[PDB]
Amino acid sequence: QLEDSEVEAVAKGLEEMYANGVTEDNFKNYVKNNFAQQEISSVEEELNVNISDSCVANKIKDEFFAMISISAIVKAAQKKAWKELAVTVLRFAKANGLKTNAIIVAGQLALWAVQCG
């Protein structure tokens, strides 16, 4: 299914952004410090989120919560099982044609689970 090199790149990004907690600030500051504007803008358009300028209605977020267990995600982040977390949210993304930067996408999905779950 998922290419393991992309899984590990996503897991490493999650580990770096969220080493000190899954927070909106840690996500946005990590993304703005590590990705080009163009890459960020593509994710913002795909997910209808604002990253480069808590819980409000979002299409994709609701479909994410209907398919993927919030409890499974939060447990993975609690244990710092970042590659477990990555495969779980990447399975949702590839299914739904979320083809923008997988590290940013995974970061946003993990944030949604923790801050909105």
Residue with tokens 């163009």: 38
- What DSSP element (H or E) covers 73? helix 70-78
- Can you give the resolution of this entry in Å? 1.8
- The sign of the dihedral angle between the CA atoms of 94, 97, 103, 105 is negative
User: Range of 32's domain?
Assistant: 4-116
Name the domain count of the chain.
1
Q: Experimental method for this entry?
A: X-ray
Burial 73-83 (b: 16+ CB within 10 A, else e): bbebbeeeebb
Q: For residues 61 and 48, give the distance between their C-alpha atoms in angstroms, rounded to a whole number.
A: 10
Angle ∠(62,3,78) on CA atoms, nearest 5 = 50
In Å, how far are 16, 35, 61, 68, 80 from 73, measured between CA atoms? 17, 24, 13, 8, 10
